Amino acid sequence: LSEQDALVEKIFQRFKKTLDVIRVRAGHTDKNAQINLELWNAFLMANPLPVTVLTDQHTSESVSMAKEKVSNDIAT
Amino acid sequence: EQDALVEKIFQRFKKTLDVIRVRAGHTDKNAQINLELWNAFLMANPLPVTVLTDQHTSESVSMAKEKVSNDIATF
Amino acid sequence: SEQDALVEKIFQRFKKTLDVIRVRAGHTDKNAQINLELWNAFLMANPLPVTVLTDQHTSESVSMAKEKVSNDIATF
Amino acid sequence: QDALVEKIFQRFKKTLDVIRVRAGHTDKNAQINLELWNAFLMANPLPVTVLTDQHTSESVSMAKEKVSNDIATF
Numbered sequence: 001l002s003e004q005d006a007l008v009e010k011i012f013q014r015f016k017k018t019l020d021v022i023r024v025r026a027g028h029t030d031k032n033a034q035i036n037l038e039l040w041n042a043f044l045m046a047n048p049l050p051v052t053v054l055t056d057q058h059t060s061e062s063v064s065m066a067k068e069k070v071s072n073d074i075a076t
Numbered sequence: 077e078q079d080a081l082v083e084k085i086f087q088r089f090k091k092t093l094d095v096i097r098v099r100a101g102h103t104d105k106n107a108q109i110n111l112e113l114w115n116a117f118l119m120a121n122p123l124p125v126t127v128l129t130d131q132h133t134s135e136s137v138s139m140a141k142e143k144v145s146n147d148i149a150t151f
Numbered sequence: 152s153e154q155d156a157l158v159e160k161i162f163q164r165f166k167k168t169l170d171v172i173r174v175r176a177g178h179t180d181k182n183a184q185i186n187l188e189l190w191n192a193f194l195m196a197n198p199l200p201v202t203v204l205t206d207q208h209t210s211e212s213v214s215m216a217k218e219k220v221s222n223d224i225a226t227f
Numbered sequence: 228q229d230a231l232v233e234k235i236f237q238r239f240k241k242t243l244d245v246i247r248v249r250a251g252h253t254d255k256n257a258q259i260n261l262e263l264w265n266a267f268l269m270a271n272p273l274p275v276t277v278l279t280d281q282h283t284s285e286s287v288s289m290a291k292e293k294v295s296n297d298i299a300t301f
């Protein structure tokens with residue numbers, strides 16, 4: 001009702017389209033990330049690892065190489 | 077008048093919102109690619125049974141979750 | 152310049168929230184790129200005789216994971 | 228002025244919270260994904276690691292093309 005509130009609502013409406021795109025996409029990405037973890041779970045239950053070696057214990061050379069490539073990509 | 081102020085506010089935010097929007101957009105695209113690759117991989121290498129985390133969480137998944145939780149707490 | 156001082160104040164109020172979102176989006180984008188590189192190396196070393204995508208046929212494992220996560224999102 | 232600035236932020240807070248929470252869980256899950264790749268590849272090592280700049284797997288190319296069509300139509 002107040003003129004200040006009307007301005008605040010107008011500011012939000014100017015941002016709404018952009019925020020909607022970000023928010024909706026973040027929802028789809030979050031859902032897909034959860035599906036990815038469920039697929040990892042089913043895959044590893046069916047194909048178990050004798051030991052689970054995480055990066056703080058030892059980083060696979062494949063992971064190191066992939067990280068270095070993407071780092072160079074981002075640096076360009 | 078009022079609209080010119082509102083447009084000025086949005087333009088001040090645009091570059092930051094663009095960076096966020098572009099990064100989230102490519103992440104969403106890559107997440108969709110990731111699922112298609114899972115599909116092709118599992119079609120070629122099927123699982124006799126599909127065990128989801130509500131039935132049983134793999135010890136490997138639990139260890140990875142615990143490690144990442146410690147990383148996020150200390151990073 | 153009176154409007155610009157207010158516009159700058161509004162941005163500074165949001166900066167901390169926007170920085171957190173932007174920095175995480177950057178780390179997530181980098182990790183998603185690494186994930187694709189690891190798929191590439193994994194599939195080059197372990198090629199698929201045929202590549203069946205979900206529009207041709209959706210693996211029952213993918214269908215089950217999608218349904219589980221969809222129920223998770225609906226209940227939460 | 229400051230009361231107006233806070234009103235603007237509070238109007239956006241709920242939308243920004245949803246975005247922040249979703250992005251945070253996605254970032255966490257992406258980290259878990261990389262740790263699982265590490266454990267999987269330590270247990271099942273690759274004789275050579277071929278990245279996309281050397282050669283892109285036909286499976287990756289096909290998946291990329293399908294997803295591009297999906298994003299264009301959805």
Ligand SMILES: [Cl-]
Pocket residue numbers: 057058059060
């Ligand atoms: Cl190491």
Ligand SMILES: [Cl-]
Pocket residue numbers: 059060061062
């Ligand atoms: Cl290694």
Ligand SMILES: [Cl-]
Pocket residue numbers: 098
């Ligand atoms: Cl782009």
Ligand SMILES: [Cl-]
Pocket residue numbers: 037129
């Ligand atoms: Cl989980």
Ligand SMILES: [Cl-]
Pocket residue numbers: 129130
């Ligand atoms: Cl669960």
Ligand SMILES: [Cl-]
Pocket residue numbers: 131132133134
């Ligand atoms: Cl369990």
Ligand SMILES: [Cl-]
Pocket residue numbers: 133134135136
């Ligand atoms: Cl287990």
Ligand SMILES: [Cl-]
Pocket residue numbers: 207208209210
């Ligand atoms: Cl199907």
Ligand SMILES: [Cl-]
Pocket residue numbers: 209210211212
């Ligand atoms: Cl199937």
Ligand SMILES: [Cl-]
Pocket residue numbers: 281282283284
């Ligand atoms: Cl190529």
Ligand SMILES: [Cl-]
Pocket residue numbers: 283284285286
């Ligand atoms: Cl190939």
Ligand SMILES: [Mg+2]
Pocket residue numbers: 046047048
């Ligand atoms: Mg096996």
Ligand SMILES: [Mg+2]
Pocket residue numbers: 036110186260
């Ligand atoms: Mg993955």
Ligand SMILES: [Mg+2]
Pocket residue numbers: 270271272
């Ligand atoms: Mg093996």
